[PDB]
Amino acid sequence: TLAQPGGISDPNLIKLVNKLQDVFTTVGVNNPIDLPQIVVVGSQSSGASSVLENIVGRDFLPRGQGIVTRRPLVLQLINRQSDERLADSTDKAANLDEWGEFLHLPGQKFYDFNKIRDEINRETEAKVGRNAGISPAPINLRIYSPHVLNLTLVDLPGLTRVPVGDQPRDIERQIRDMILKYIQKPNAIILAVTAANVDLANSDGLKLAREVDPEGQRTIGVLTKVDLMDEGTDVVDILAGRIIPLRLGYVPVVNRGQRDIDNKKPITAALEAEKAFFENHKAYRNKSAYCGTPYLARKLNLILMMHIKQTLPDIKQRISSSLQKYQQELEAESDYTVRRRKECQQMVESLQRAAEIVSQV
Amino acid sequence: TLAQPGGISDPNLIKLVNKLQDVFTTVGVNNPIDLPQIVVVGSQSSGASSVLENIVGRDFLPRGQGIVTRRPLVLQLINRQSSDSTDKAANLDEWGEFLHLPGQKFYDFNKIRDEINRETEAKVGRNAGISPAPINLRIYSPHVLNLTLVDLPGLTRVPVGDQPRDIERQIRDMILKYIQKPNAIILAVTAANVDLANSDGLKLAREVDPEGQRTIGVLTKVDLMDEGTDVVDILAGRIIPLRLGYVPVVNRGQRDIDNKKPITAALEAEKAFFENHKAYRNKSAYCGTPYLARKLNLILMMHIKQTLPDIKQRISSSLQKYQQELEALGSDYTVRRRKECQQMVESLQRAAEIVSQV
Ligand SMILES: Nc1nc2c(ncn2[C@@H]2O[C@H](COP(=O)(O)OP(=O)(O)CP(=O)(O)O)[C@@H](O)[C@H]2O)c(=O)[nH]1
Ligand SMILES: Nc1nc2c(ncn2[C@@H]2O[C@H](COP(=O)(O)OP(=O)(O)CP(=O)(O)O)[C@@H](O)[C@H]2O)c(=O)[nH]1
Ligand SMILES: [Mg+2]
Ligand SMILES: [Mg+2]
């Protein structure tokens, strides 16, 4: 189950959105909650696909050596309330409440997230072959679950310097222009991913994020590969804010190495290895709870909570002003007058009830 | 001493060049030996300064964390036959002189290192500033060629400290100055712990050497790779191929630098790493500073030998001319003249002999 306390699929965050959708319906608004997209951006092989996969909480994105992500993967998470059909699933988490559908495969359902991964590899090769070609044409994936928000996440090819295989001379500009399409949207949280085993000032993720978000208002820095740093080096000076500071700060993570991927090590054991690495390192033992994938998921949870609560002032205003109106209108008699007193009274009670639910956030 | 068999300061290479230069000057023939400059280029913190240091064979370049090389270091190695130090290799035959300190001599290569740090701070301070103004260093030794080597600031993407918004273009323009020269070997330095497609060293090298004819890829930090990864596919030529190929190396890590580990122990650690690694054990002769040194030695040897046919031609045609003049003389003036022409013919014979041996 993709339910994960603390993260973007925190049960309380789902409960909050359902409660507000019930309020909006009774007060007569189409739900105005506009959740930002989450977009990962960095140099090629910074570990972007692994960071995005960890936020979703189940494996489905191709990860490996060489050039892997060669088309945008636009994932729509869609909230949907709810056996032989899982005969020869290889996915131990596979269940009838959660599946994927690809736009390019109408009516096919993937309960097995390994098959989602296989399909992303196949659809990539169908359009751009097996010699490093890249296309801006997105692969559109929807994932249905009772435990997710209505939210878009984007995985993107990494920025490169040197064309390989079938890539043209100007591949760097083409990947730069493809990425700007997704992060120029003011409603986009930019996860600027940089490998900790390169100097931060070489980060293409940070350079691009600073071009479109110079105030650093929707950019979180992610430092991958902290386990691969030269002995006695660390990212503490970056976390302490002394080097390219970001308003929203940086989170160091340790994802699976290529040996873990080849050994098919599961996400849960990878999360436990990451906790142990940070609790046992001299330099990260201090405030170790601010290290790792769970802290990045928490940062995102809080931003998403700020977006939902950002709507309440406007709503409190509309509730009280329509409450005042019906109370004034509410000052033997005709079929009209009796019916209208009843409708106005039913309305007053809903707006009281709505006002109560909004106060208790 | 800085003499190192197999590298750019191979004693046989020094002997050969001095012998030919003595011939050219004694017989009146233009010296065509034009040795390329050797220029290191890469991303900031790829390990460029350490690769250049290892080619010279004694420590003198600032290395460490953050932005370290912040001005060009143009080193002229100059061959010179001889007549309170903290440097155990210090000797009266080998010293450095900086243009900006005229007539000061540094026998202690630690002091050379200290002076590069001080002259860097004097012009661009201690908050990451960068200048294209070179620090000009000459190193005098009986054991070196007349050879120019250049260390350069790394290419960066994001300005830090005092750096201006357009620092990337300024560093790119400063580097192109040195590698646009067709007579430059480009050492494109890339950390092995990033995918080669991210190499700024290879991107810049490809702008001036698109055919990849004068570029050696150097892969540093092979000791820092993700467990079970290796650079074998790059060494096998299957990824951005270069005529002159790639050399993997392992330099001192920051802990080695903090512990002041000497160059000799670092070269022995590198040899053991490659002899003992699953992926490199059968190919260890193609690994390390010594293989990079050998590649450079061989290129230099090809340039010297490439000139000899043209030279043999000019020597014999000069010999033919003096022989014709001498046969013209066949009275105290006449006898002196016959002797001078005879002495001249013998020089060119002798010269022709010495060149044929090679
Ligand atoms: N040791 C270690 N290896 C990591 C880490 N994160 C990712 N890797 C390794 O880096 C490689 C790239 O992982 P990946 O998620 O595919 O990176 P990416 O940036 O998406 C690759 P592309 O840009 O081509 O899509 C894999 O070999 C993976 O195991 C990390 O935190 N630690
Ligand atoms: N483990 C390991 N660390 C390396 C390697 N080469 C260099 N380092 C480390 O990388 C850092 C940079 O080394 P340095 O030689 O100064 O690199 P650079 O590219 O010249 C730095 P700048 O671009 O700022 O001048 C130092 O901490 C050094 O010890 C290597 O092969 N292995
Ligand atoms: Mg990827
Ligand atoms: Mg340097």
Side-chain angles (χ1 to χ4, degrees):
Chain A
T1 172
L2 291 161
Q4 64 169 19
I8 66 163
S9 301
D10 170 61
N12 287 345
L13 203 58
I14 278 70
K15 276 182 262 278
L16 179 79
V17 166
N18 289 336
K19 213 145 41 185
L20 288 176
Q21 284 174 352
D22 292 1
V23 159
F24 303 148
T25 307
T26 83
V27 71
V29 173
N30 284 355
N31 170 306
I33 298 160
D34 197 19
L35 289 187
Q37 318 179 242
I38 299 163
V39 184
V40 297
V41 301
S43 313
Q44 192 286 325
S45 62
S46 68
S49 303
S50 312
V51 166
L52 194 60
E53 216 184 44
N54 286 324
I55 290 157
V56 174
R58 277 171 75 180
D59 295 346
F60 65 107
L61 294 168
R63 300 184 280 131
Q65 295 183 279
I67 303 171
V68 174
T69 317
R70 288 184 302 125
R71 299 177 56 188
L73 193 295
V74 180
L75 165 58
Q76 232 176 319
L77 293 180
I78 298 157
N79 191 254
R80 175 153 301 172
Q81 276 304 321
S82 68
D83 185 37
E84 169 281 337
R85 276 200 264 178
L86 306 174
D88 196 346
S89 168
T90 60
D91 183 8
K92 283 307 138 70
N95 70 89
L96 298 179
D97 289 344
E98 306 185 319
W99 69 96
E101 297 188 36
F102 295 99
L103 197 280
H104 73 279
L105 297 173
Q108 280 198 59
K109 292 180 204 220
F110 301 69
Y111 295 100
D112 182 343
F113 278 38
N114 302 320
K115 289 188 184 127
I116 301 181
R117 188 167 51 205
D118 295 336
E119 187 50 27
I120 295 168
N121 276 315
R122 173 180 309 95
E123 183 50 22
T124 298
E125 291 179 14
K127 293 263 190 314
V128 296
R130 304 171 66 195
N131 196 32
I134 290 184
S135 164
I139 298 162
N140 290 288
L141 173 69
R142 292 157 164 269
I143 288 171
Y144 293 99
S145 168
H147 309 106
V148 298
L149 295 171
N150 302 300
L151 203 54
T152 298
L153 295 83
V154 185
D155 195 10
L156 289 165
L159 272 132
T160 49
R161 315 278 170 81
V162 188
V164 291
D166 294 346
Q167 288 174 352
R169 264 216 181 74
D170 67 331
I171 188 59
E172 178 174 12
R173 174 155 326 114
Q174 290 173 27
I175 294 169
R176 174 181 184 279
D177 295 349
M178 175 187 317
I179 295 165
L180 291 165
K181 194 300 205 179
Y182 290 91
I183 64 159
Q184 267 169 355
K185 296 171 143 51
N187 210 28
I189 304 157
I190 311 167
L191 301 187
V193 185
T194 320
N197 62 351
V198 315
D199 195 287
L200 203 62
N202 277 107
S203 180
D204 292 299
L206 282 165
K207 172 165 162 65
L208 268 176
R210 282 183 17 155
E211 266 166 40
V212 308
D213 177 25
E215 56 160 288
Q217 186 60 74
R218 49 186 190 99
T219 298
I220 306 164
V222 180
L223 308 170
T224 62
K225 294 186 194 186
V226 173
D227 53 318
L228 300 190
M229 286 181 86
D230 193 22
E231 201 217 340
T233 72
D234 61 56
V235 292
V236 171
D237 285 335
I238 301 158
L239 302 187
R242 293 165 159 164
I243 306 179
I244 304 155
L246 283 177
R247 305 195 346 116
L248 307 186
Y250 293 86
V251 182
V253 303
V254 173
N255 315 131
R256 288 172 280 192
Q258 184 59 43
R259 180 141 282 164
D260 298 328
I261 291 166
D262 296 343
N263 290 344
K264 278 194 196 55
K265 177 167 187 184
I267 192 161
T268 323
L271 293 179
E272 303 180 344
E274 169 181 67
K275 198 115 158 315
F277 171 89
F278 286 119
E279 292 170 353
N280 290 67
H281 201 289
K282 293 180 182 308
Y284 307 121
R285 122 144 279 260
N286 196 85
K287 59 168 173 197
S288 86
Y290 287 140
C291 291
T293 294
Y295 184 62
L296 177 58
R298 204 200 165 186
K299 263 261 69 154
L300 289 169
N301 172 293
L302 289 175
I303 290 167
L304 285 183
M305 204 185 287
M306 292 198 73
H307 266 258
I308 298 153
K309 308 293 191 50
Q310 128 173 37
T311 64
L312 293 188
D314 200 29
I315 275 294
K316 285 185 80 180
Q317 164 86 291
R318 182 155 209 198
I319 287 163
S320 30
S321 103
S322 107
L323 188 46
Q324 280 164 39
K325 165 207 176 175
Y326 283 116
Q327 253 156 0
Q328 285 166 328
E329 210 174 320
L330 203 34
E331 290 137 18
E333 61 261 351
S334 72
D335 176 325
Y336 171 61
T337 59
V338 307
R339 196 194 147 182
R340 188 67 197 169
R341 116 157 64 264
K342 218 155 277 178
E343 296 168 4
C344 280
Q345 101 198 352
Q346 285 186 10
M347 262 306 91
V348 168
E349 69 155 14
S350 300
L351 295 165
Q352 279 168 341
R353 187 210 210 261
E356 262 181 322
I357 289 168
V358 177
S359 256
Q360 323 325 330
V361 285
Chain B
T1 86
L2 289 160
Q4 237 301 162
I8 63 163
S9 300
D10 168 64
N12 284 350
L13 194 60
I14 275 70
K15 276 164 222 203
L16 179 49
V17 169
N18 290 338
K19 221 167 183 179
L20 289 176
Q21 286 180 352
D22 284 21
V23 165
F24 302 150
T25 50
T26 84
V27 309
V29 153
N30 291 19
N31 180 354
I33 300 344
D34 196 17
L35 298 179
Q37 315 201 312
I38 297 164
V39 182
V40 300
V41 168
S43 315
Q44 191 286 326
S45 60
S46 68
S49 294
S50 312
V51 170
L52 198 58
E53 217 181 27
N54 284 136
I55 291 159
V56 179
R58 277 168 74 180
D59 290 353
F60 67 101
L61 290 171
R63 302 176 284 123
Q65 287 186 102
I67 316 293
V68 185
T69 316
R70 289 183 302 122
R71 298 178 55 188
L73 193 296
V74 186
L75 166 59
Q76 276 141 221
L77 293 181
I78 298 164
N79 191 253
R80 175 180 300 198
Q81 302 307 319
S82 70
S83 325
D84 253 27
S85 165
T86 62
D87 182 10
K88 288 212 227 72
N91 70 90
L92 298 177
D93 290 338
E94 305 185 319
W95 69 94
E97 298 181 34
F98 295 101
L99 221 67
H100 73 279
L101 297 172
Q104 286 169 58
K105 291 184 201 216
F106 300 70
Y107 298 102
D108 185 340
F109 278 38
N110 300 319
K111 298 313 192 167
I112 300 180
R113 188 165 53 200
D114 295 335
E115 187 51 28
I116 295 164
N117 277 314
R118 179 177 340 269
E119 184 49 22
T120 298
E121 290 175 5
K123 295 257 186 322
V124 294
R126 287 190 292 269
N127 193 32
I130 294 185
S131 167
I135 299 163
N136 285 284
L137 173 68
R138 291 171 129 178
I139 289 174
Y140 290 99
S141 170
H143 307 106
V144 297
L145 294 168
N146 304 305
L147 202 56
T148 294
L149 294 83
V150 183
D151 196 10
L152 287 168
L155 196 51
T156 48
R157 297 267 157 188
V158 181
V160 291
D162 293 348
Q163 287 173 357
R165 260 137 32 212
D166 66 334
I167 187 61
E168 178 176 8
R169 187 213 89 248
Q170 289 181 4
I171 293 170
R172 177 174 141 71
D173 296 349
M174 175 191 318
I175 295 163
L176 290 166
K177 195 207 177 297
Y178 290 92
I179 64 160
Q180 269 172 352
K181 296 170 164 143
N183 210 27
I185 302 159
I186 312 172
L187 304 187
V189 186
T190 319
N193 58 1
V194 313
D195 188 291
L196 207 60
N198 270 94
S199 180
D200 286 306
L202 287 169
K203 168 163 171 209
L204 269 160
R206 164 179 298 186
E207 267 174 51
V208 298
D209 177 25
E211 291 166 289
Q213 301 306 108
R214 51 183 189 93
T215 301
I216 302 167
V218 179
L219 310 167
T220 62
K221 297 187 189 191
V222 182
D223 53 316
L224 300 189
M225 286 179 86
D226 194 23
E227 205 211 280
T229 66
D230 63 55
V231 294
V232 170
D233 288 334
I234 301 157
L235 303 187
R238 293 202 259 273
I239 307 197
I240 306 154
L242 290 177
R243 175 192 154 238
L244 302 169
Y246 288 88
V247 184
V249 302
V250 172
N251 299 316
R252 287 170 280 193
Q254 187 58 42
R255 179 136 279 154
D256 300 331
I257 290 166
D258 296 342
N259 291 346
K260 282 163 122 102
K261 176 177 198 169
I263 193 161
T264 312
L267 292 175
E268 302 188 347
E270 170 175 68
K271 196 169 131 140
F273 173 89
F274 284 119
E275 291 176 346
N276 288 312
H277 196 287
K278 247 287 148 328
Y280 307 124
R281 148 155 283 169
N282 32 32
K283 37 210 162 289
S284 89
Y286 297 82
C287 293
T289 294
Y291 182 55
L292 177 55
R294 162 164 191 76
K295 281 213 210 259
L296 292 167
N297 174 292
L298 286 180
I299 289 167
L300 291 186
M301 265 302 304
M302 274 180 22
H303 183 49
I304 300 152
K305 294 195 146 164
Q306 235 157 34
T307 66
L308 292 190
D310 270 26
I311 272 296
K312 284 184 208 161
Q313 209 289 301
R314 286 198 280 287
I315 288 166
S316 31
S317 105
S318 168
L319 179 47
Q320 280 167 41
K321 175 201 162 223
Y322 283 114
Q323 251 154 0
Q324 181 53 50
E325 288 176 358
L326 165 56
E327 337 210 323
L329 330 161
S331 174
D332 204 17
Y333 198 47
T334 304
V335 51
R336 288 176 47 183
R337 243 348 244 169
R338 185 180 339 267
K339 283 170 185 166
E340 293 156 347
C341 285
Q342 243 156 12
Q343 290 163 225
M344 199 54 54
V345 164
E346 281 154 16
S347 288
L348 283 155
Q349 279 169 334
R350 193 158 167 283
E353 264 159 17
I354 288 165
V355 180
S356 315
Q357 293 148 0
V358 187

mmCIF file with all atom_site columns, all heavy atoms in Angstrom, chain B residues 35-50:
data_model
loop_
_atom_site.group_PDB
_atom_site.id
_atom_site.type_symbol
_atom_site.label_atom_id
_atom_site.label_alt_id
_atom_site.label_comp_id
_atom_site.label_asym_id
_atom_site.label_entity_id
_atom_site.label_seq_id
_atom_site.pdbx_PDB_ins_code
_atom_site.Cartn_x
_atom_site.Cartn_y
_atom_site.Cartn_z
_atom_site.occupancy
_atom_site.B_iso_or_equiv
_atom_site.pdbx_formal_charge
_atom_site.auth_seq_id
_atom_site.auth_comp_id
_atom_site.auth_asym_id
_atom_site.auth_atom_id
_atom_site.pdbx_PDB_model_num
ATOM 1   N N   . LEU B 1 35 ? 58.273 21.027 -29.212 1.00 0.00 ? 35 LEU B N   1
ATOM 2   C CA  . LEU B 1 35 ? 57.546 20.125 -28.282 1.00 0.00 ? 35 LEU B CA  1
ATOM 3   C C   . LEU B 1 35 ? 56.229 20.789 -27.918 1.00 0.00 ? 35 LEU B C   1
ATOM 4   O O   . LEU B 1 35 ? 56.191 21.971 -27.621 1.00 0.00 ? 35 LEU B O   1
ATOM 5   C CB  . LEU B 1 35 ? 58.390 19.858 -27.037 1.00 0.00 ? 35 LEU B CB  1
ATOM 6   C CG  . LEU B 1 35 ? 59.712 19.146 -27.293 1.00 0.00 ? 35 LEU B CG  1
ATOM 7   C CD1 . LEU B 1 35 ? 60.499 18.937 -26.018 1.00 0.00 ? 35 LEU B CD1 1
ATOM 8   C CD2 . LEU B 1 35 ? 59.496 17.831 -27.982 1.00 0.00 ? 35 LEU B CD2 1
ATOM 9   N N   . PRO B 1 36 ? 55.106 20.044 -27.911 1.00 0.00 ? 36 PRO B N   1
ATOM 10  C CA  . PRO B 1 36 ? 53.822 20.611 -27.524 1.00 0.00 ? 36 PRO B CA  1
ATOM 11  C C   . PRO B 1 36 ? 53.854 21.057 -26.060 1.00 0.00 ? 36 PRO B C   1
ATOM 12  O O   . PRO B 1 36 ? 54.626 20.543 -25.302 1.00 0.00 ? 36 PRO B O   1
ATOM 13  C CB  . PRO B 1 36 ? 52.847 19.446 -27.735 1.00 0.00 ? 36 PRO B CB  1
ATOM 14  C CG  . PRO B 1 36 ? 53.692 18.216 -27.623 1.00 0.00 ? 36 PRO B CG  1
ATOM 15  C CD  . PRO B 1 36 ? 55.016 18.617 -28.224 1.00 0.00 ? 36 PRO B CD  1
ATOM 16  N N   . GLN B 1 37 ? 53.052 22.049 -25.726 1.00 0.00 ? 37 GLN B N   1
ATOM 17  C CA  . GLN B 1 37 ? 52.683 22.330 -24.322 1.00 0.00 ? 37 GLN B CA  1
ATOM 18  C C   . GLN B 1 37 ? 51.773 21.185 -23.844 1.00 0.00 ? 37 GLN B C   1
ATOM 19  O O   . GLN B 1 37 ? 51.075 20.595 -24.647 1.00 0.00 ? 37 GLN B O   1
ATOM 20  C CB  . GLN B 1 37 ? 51.853 23.591 -24.187 1.00 0.00 ? 37 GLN B CB  1
ATOM 21  C CG  . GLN B 1 37 ? 52.340 24.784 -24.986 1.00 0.00 ? 37 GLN B CG  1
ATOM 22  C CD  . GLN B 1 37 ? 51.785 26.065 -24.391 1.00 0.00 ? 37 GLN B CD  1
ATOM 23  O OE1 . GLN B 1 37 ? 50.584 26.199 -24.111 1.00 0.00 ? 37 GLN B OE1 1
ATOM 24  N NE2 . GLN B 1 37 ? 52.682 27.010 -24.179 1.00 0.00 ? 37 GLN B NE2 1
ATOM 25  N N   . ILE B 1 38 ? 51.735 20.952 -22.554 1.00 0.00 ? 38 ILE B N   1
ATOM 26  C CA  . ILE B 1 38 ? 50.835 19.967 -21.917 1.00 0.00 ? 38 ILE B CA  1
ATOM 27  C C   . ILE B 1 38 ? 49.907 20.752 -20.988 1.00 0.00 ? 38 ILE B C   1
ATOM 28  O O   . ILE B 1 38 ? 50.417 21.424 -20.074 1.00 0.00 ? 38 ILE B O   1
ATOM 29  C CB  . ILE B 1 38 ? 51.685 18.940 -21.161 1.00 0.00 ? 38 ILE B CB  1
ATOM 30  C CG1 . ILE B 1 38 ? 52.579 18.164 -22.153 1.00 0.00 ? 38 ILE B CG1 1
ATOM 31  C CG2 . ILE B 1 38 ? 50.769 18.037 -20.340 1.00 0.00 ? 38 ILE B CG2 1
ATOM 32  C CD1 . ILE B 1 38 ? 53.716 17.408 -21.518 1.00 0.00 ? 38 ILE B CD1 1
ATOM 33  N N   . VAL B 1 39 ? 48.608 20.674 -21.250 1.00 0.00 ? 39 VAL B N   1
ATOM 34  C CA  . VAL B 1 39 ? 47.575 21.510 -20.587 1.00 0.00 ? 39 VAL B CA  1
ATOM 35  C C   . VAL B 1 39 ? 46.516 20.603 -19.971 1.00 0.00 ? 39 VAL B C   1
ATOM 36  O O   . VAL B 1 39 ? 45.953 19.783 -20.728 1.00 0.00 ? 39 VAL B O   1
ATOM 37  C CB  . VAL B 1 39 ? 46.959 22.487 -21.588 1.00 0.00 ? 39 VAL B CB  1
ATOM 38  C CG1 . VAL B 1 39 ? 45.949 23.377 -20.888 1.00 0.00 ? 39 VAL B CG1 1
ATOM 39  C CG2 . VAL B 1 39 ? 48.046 23.310 -22.262 1.00 0.00 ? 39 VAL B CG2 1
ATOM 40  N N   . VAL B 1 40 ? 46.278 20.742 -18.656 1.00 0.00 ? 40 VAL B N   1
ATOM 41  C CA  . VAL B 1 40 ? 45.195 20.031 -17.932 1.00 0.00 ? 40 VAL B CA  1
ATOM 42  C C   . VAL B 1 40 ? 43.967 20.910 -17.843 1.00 0.00 ? 40 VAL B C   1
ATOM 43  O O   . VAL B 1 40 ? 44.066 22.080 -17.467 1.00 0.00 ? 40 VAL B O   1
ATOM 44  C CB  . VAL B 1 40 ? 45.574 19.593 -16.516 1.00 0.00 ? 40 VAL B CB  1
ATOM 45  C CG1 . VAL B 1 40 ? 46.761 18.655 -16.534 1.00 0.00 ? 40 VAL B CG1 1
ATOM 46  C CG2 . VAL B 1 40 ? 45.858 20.766 -15.631 1.00 0.00 ? 40 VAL B CG2 1
ATOM 47  N N   . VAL B 1 41 ? 42.831 20.292 -18.061 1.00 0.00 ? 41 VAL B N   1
ATOM 48  C CA  . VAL B 1 41 ? 41.537 20.977 -18.182 1.00 0.00 ? 41 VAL B CA  1
ATOM 49  C C   . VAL B 1 41 ? 40.513 20.026 -17.600 1.00 0.00 ? 41 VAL B C   1
ATOM 50  O O   . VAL B 1 41 ? 40.534 18.825 -17.972 1.00 0.00 ? 41 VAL B O   1
ATOM 51  C CB  . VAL B 1 41 ? 41.233 21.233 -19.671 1.00 0.00 ? 41 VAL B CB  1
ATOM 52  C CG1 . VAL B 1 41 ? 39.787 21.672 -19.834 1.00 0.00 ? 41 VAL B CG1 1
ATOM 53  C CG2 . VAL B 1 41 ? 42.217 22.223 -20.307 1.00 0.00 ? 41 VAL B CG2 1
ATOM 54  N N   . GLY B 1 42 ? 39.606 20.534 -16.803 1.00 0.00 ? 42 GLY B N   1
ATOM 55  C CA  . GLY B 1 42 ? 38.426 19.768 -16.371 1.00 0.00 ? 42 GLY B CA  1
ATOM 56  C C   . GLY B 1 42 ? 37.488 20.594 -15.550 1.00 0.00 ? 42 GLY B C   1
ATOM 57  O O   . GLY B 1 42 ? 37.763 21.799 -15.318 1.00 0.00 ? 42 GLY B O   1
ATOM 58  N N   . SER B 1 43 ? 36.434 19.949 -15.089 1.00 0.00 ? 43 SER B N   1
ATOM 59  C CA  . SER B 1 43 ? 35.549 20.521 -14.056 1.00 0.00 ? 43 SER B CA  1
ATOM 60  C C   . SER B 1 43 ? 36.388 20.885 -12.809 1.00 0.00 ? 43 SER B C   1
ATOM 61  O O   . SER B 1 43 ? 37.406 20.277 -12.540 1.00 0.00 ? 43 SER B O   1
ATOM 62  C CB  . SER B 1 43 ? 34.414 19.611 -13.758 1.00 0.00 ? 43 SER B CB  1
ATOM 63  O OG  . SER B 1 43 ? 33.872 19.137 -14.987 1.00 0.00 ? 43 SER B OG  1
ATOM 64  N N   . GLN B 1 44 ? 35.903 21.853 -12.060 1.00 0.00 ? 44 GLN B N   1
ATOM 65  C CA  . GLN B 1 44 ? 36.497 22.211 -10.766 1.00 0.00 ? 44 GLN B CA  1
ATOM 66  C C   . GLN B 1 44 ? 36.415 20.943 -9.904  1.00 0.00 ? 44 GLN B C   1
ATOM 67  O O   . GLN B 1 44 ? 35.413 20.279 -9.967  1.00 0.00 ? 44 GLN B O   1
ATOM 68  C CB  . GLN B 1 44 ? 35.806 23.499 -10.291 1.00 0.00 ? 44 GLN B CB  1
ATOM 69  C CG  . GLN B 1 44 ? 36.474 24.141 -9.098  1.00 0.00 ? 44 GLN B CG  1
ATOM 70  C CD  . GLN B 1 44 ? 36.138 23.301 -7.895  1.00 0.00 ? 44 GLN B CD  1
ATOM 71  O OE1 . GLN B 1 44 ? 35.043 22.739 -7.831  1.00 0.00 ? 44 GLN B OE1 1
ATOM 72  N NE2 . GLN B 1 44 ? 37.098 23.123 -7.005  1.00 0.00 ? 44 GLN B NE2 1
ATOM 73  N N   . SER B 1 45 ? 37.512 20.621 -9.212  1.00 0.00 ? 45 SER B N   1
ATOM 74  C CA  . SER B 1 45 ? 37.745 19.503 -8.256  1.00 0.00 ? 45 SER B CA  1
ATOM 75  C C   . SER B 1 45 ? 37.776 18.131 -8.959  1.00 0.00 ? 45 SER B C   1
ATOM 76  O O   . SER B 1 45 ? 37.717 17.180 -8.251  1.00 0.00 ? 45 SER B O   1
ATOM 77  C CB  . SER B 1 45 ? 36.793 19.518 -7.100  1.00 0.00 ? 45 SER B CB  1
ATOM 78  O OG  . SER B 1 45 ? 35.458 19.408 -7.537  1.00 0.00 ? 45 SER B OG  1
ATOM 79  N N   . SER B 1 46 ? 38.002 18.047 -10.273 1.00 0.00 ? 46 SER B N   1
ATOM 80  C CA  . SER B 1 46 ? 38.260 16.791 -11.022 1.00 0.00 ? 46 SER B CA  1
ATOM 81  C C   . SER B 1 46 ? 39.653 16.205 -10.655 1.00 0.00 ? 46 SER B C   1
ATOM 82  O O   . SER B 1 46 ? 39.920 15.005 -10.897 1.00 0.00 ? 46 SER B O   1
ATOM 83  C CB  . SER B 1 46 ? 38.128 17.048 -12.486 1.00 0.00 ? 46 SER B CB  1
ATOM 84  O OG  . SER B 1 46 ? 39.196 17.881 -12.882 1.00 0.00 ? 46 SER B OG  1
ATOM 85  N N   . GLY B 1 47 ? 40.570 16.990 -10.116 1.00 0.00 ? 47 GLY B N   1
ATOM 86  C CA  . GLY B 1 47 ? 41.886 16.448 -9.737  1.00 0.00 ? 47 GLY B CA  1
ATOM 87  C C   . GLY B 1 47 ? 42.997 16.858 -10.675 1.00 0.00 ? 47 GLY B C   1
ATOM 88  O O   . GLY B 1 47 ? 44.089 16.252 -10.629 1.00 0.00 ? 47 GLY B O   1
ATOM 89  N N   . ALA B 1 48 ? 42.826 17.975 -11.365 1.00 0.00 ? 48 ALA B N   1
ATOM 90  C CA  . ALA B 1 48 ? 43.758 18.466 -12.405 1.00 0.00 ? 48 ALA B CA  1
ATOM 91  C C   . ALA B 1 48 ? 45.115 18.786 -11.808 1.00 0.00 ? 48 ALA B C   1
ATOM 92  O O   . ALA B 1 48 ? 46.123 18.334 -12.389 1.00 0.00 ? 48 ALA B O   1
ATOM 93  C CB  . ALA B 1 48 ? 43.166 19.685 -13.051 1.00 0.00 ? 48 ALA B CB  1
ATOM 94  N N   . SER B 1 49 ? 45.153 19.583 -10.709 1.00 0.00 ? 49 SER B N   1
ATOM 95  C CA  . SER B 1 49 ? 46.429 20.024 -10.147 1.00 0.00 ? 49 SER B CA  1
ATOM 96  C C   . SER B 1 49 ? 47.243 18.765 -9.773  1.00 0.00 ? 49 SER B C   1
ATOM 97  O O   . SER B 1 49 ? 48.420 18.727 -10.022 1.00 0.00 ? 49 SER B O   1
ATOM 98  C CB  . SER B 1 49 ? 46.216 21.035 -9.018  1.00 0.00 ? 49 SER B CB  1
ATOM 99  O OG  . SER B 1 49 ? 45.633 22.304 -9.507  1.00 0.00 ? 49 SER B OG  1
ATOM 100 N N   . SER B 1 50 ? 46.615 17.717 -9.230  1.00 0.00 ? 50 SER B N   1
ATOM 101 C CA  . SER B 1 50 ? 47.303 16.494 -8.782  1.00 0.00 ? 50 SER B CA  1
ATOM 102 C C   . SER B 1 50 ? 47.828 15.726 -10.007 1.00 0.00 ? 50 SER B C   1
ATOM 103 O O   . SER B 1 50 ? 48.882 15.160 -9.960  1.00 0.00 ? 50 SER B O   1
ATOM 104 C CB  . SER B 1 50 ? 46.382 15.607 -7.976  1.00 0.00 ? 50 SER B CB  1
ATOM 105 O OG  . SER B 1 50 ? 45.710 16.320 -7.005  1.00 0.00 ? 50 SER B OG  1
#
